[PDB]
C-alpha cells in the first residue's frame, strides 16, 4: 500500500512479460505478440507462423 | 497512331523501360541525353548498341529510357539492354524481319547480355556467416 | 626533403628539364625533380597553360602529359 509497487515500471524489461508464462527475458514484441521466444516456438503454428524456407 | 514499342532491360535489380517510338534520332535516358549517363567510364556500355549496328538505325526513332532500381553500374547495364531490345523490337514490329536478324546477329555476336537479362541473382544469407557461403571464424582455443 | 616553395633556380630548372621528359606527371616532377606534389600540380597547370606540355588524359589523381610537338 505504502511502497509496494512504488517503483515505476512503465518501460524496460520489467514493464512487459510473456502472456503465456510471465517471462521478461527473450520476449518477442514484434507485431504486438508479447510471447517469449521459447513459447513462440511451441505456439508458432497456432499463431499462424510456418516454416517455409 | 505513332509506331511505338515499349521494352525493358535488367541487371541485378535495375529495370530500364525504354519507349522506342518513330522519330528523328533522339536518345534520352531518364531525362537526359545518352552523352551524359554517369559513370563516365561506363558511357561506352550505353554506347554499345548504338555503335554496333550504326547510328543510321537510330536516326529514325526516339528512345526514352526510364531506369529505376539497382546501382550506378546495374543501371548502365540496364540502359544498354533496354536500348538494344527496343531497337530489335521496333525492327520486329515495323521494319523487316531480315533487318531484325542482322541487328540481333550484331548484338549477340558481341555480347549476349545486350538482349538477354543476366540470370545471376544474389543468393540468400544464412545464419552463422556473413554471406551465402562464408561462415564466421571458429576458434578451438 | 622536398622544396615545397619555388625559388628562381628551381623555376629555371622546371622550365628547362620538363622539356625532354617523355611522360610528365605529379610523380615525375616529385621524383626526377625535387618539388612536392603541390608544386607538381601547380607546375603541371602552369606548363600546360604556357604550352610546353600537352595533356593526354588530365584526370584528377592521375595527370598524364607529353612534350609539345
Amino acid at each position: 500500500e505504502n511502497v509496494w509497487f512504488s517503483h515505476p515500471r512503465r518501460y524496460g524489461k520489467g514493464s512487459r512479460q510473456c502472456r503465456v508464462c510471465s517471462s521478461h527475458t527473450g520476449l518477442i514484441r514484434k507485431y504486438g505478440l508479447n510471447i517469449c521466444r521459447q513459447c513462440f516456438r511451441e505456439k508458432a503454428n497456432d499463431i499462424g507462423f510456418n516454416k517455409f524456407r | 497512331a505513332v509506331p511505338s514499342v515499349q521494352t525493358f532491360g535488367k541487371k541485378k535489380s535495375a529495370t530500364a523501360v525504354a519507349h522506342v517510338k518513330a522519330g528523328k534520332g533522339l536518345i534520352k535516358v531518364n531525362g537526359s541525353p545518352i552523352t551524359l549517363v554517369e559513370p563516365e567510364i561506363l558511357r561506352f556500355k550505353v554506347y554499345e548498341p548504338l555503335l554496333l549496328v550504326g547510328l543510321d538505325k537510330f536516326s529514325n526513332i526516339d528512345i526514352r529510357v526510364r531506369v529505376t532500381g539497382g546501382g550506378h553500374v546495374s543501371q548502365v547495364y540496364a540502359i544498354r539492354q533496354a536500348i538494344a531490345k527496343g531497337l530489335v523490337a521496333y525492327h520486329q514490329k515495323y521494319v523487316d524481319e531480315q533487318s531484325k536478324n542482322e541487328l540481333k546477329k550484331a548484338f549477340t555476336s558481341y555480347d549476349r547480355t545486350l538482349l538477354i537479362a543476366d540470370s545471376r541473382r544474389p543468393e540468400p544469407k544464412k545464419f552463422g556467416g556473413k554471406g551465402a557461403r562464408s561462415r564466421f571464424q571458429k576458434s578451438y582455443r | 626533403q622536398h622544396a615545397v616553395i619555388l625559388d628562381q633556380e628551381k623555376y629555371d630548372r622546371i622550365l628547362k628539364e620538363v622539356p625532354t621528359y617523355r611522360y610528365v606527371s605529379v610523380s615525375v616532377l616529385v621524383d626526377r625533380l625535387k618539388i612536392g606534389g603541390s608544386l607538381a600540380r601547380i607546375a603541371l597547370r602552369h606548363l600546360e597553360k604556357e604550352g610546353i606540355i600537352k595533356p593526354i588524359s588530365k584526370h584528377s589523381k592521375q595527370a598524364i602529359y607529353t612534350r609539345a610537338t
Binding site: - | - | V4, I5, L6, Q8, Y11, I42, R45, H46
Partner: protein
Amino acid sequence: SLVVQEQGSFQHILRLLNTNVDGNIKIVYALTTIKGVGRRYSNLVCKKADVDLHKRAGELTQEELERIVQIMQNPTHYKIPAWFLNRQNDITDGKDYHTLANNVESKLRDDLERLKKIRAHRGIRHFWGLRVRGQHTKTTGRRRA
C-alpha cells in the same frame, strides 16, 4: 577563380606562442602543432585573420602572424562564437576561454587537481591511473593505462 604561380620569399621554422611552428607546411596545419589549436580553430583563425590559406607559414609575414596570435589569444572579440572554444563557462569565473599551448597542460592539470582535491570519484580514478570514462578495464588497456 584561377590558378597562379608564385616565388619563394620564404623563411623556415618560426616560434609562436612558445611553439616551434615549422615552415614548409600550410598555415592551418602548421598552427596545429600548437597545443590547444587544432584544425577547425586553425581554419577559423586563418579565415578571421585575412590570411591566404595557401602560403606555407613561412611565406606569411610577421604582421599576419601577429594578427593570427591576437585572434587565437582573444577569440571572442573577433566573432568566434564561443561554442567553438575550450573552456566555455570556465570552472571558476564563468568566462569562455580558449586555452593555448603551455596553458592546456596547466588547465588540464589544474582541473585534475581540482577533481582530486574535492575527493570526487573521477578524481580518484585519475589519481590511481585508471580509466575515468566508465570503460571496461577487464580486457583492454592491458599494457599501459
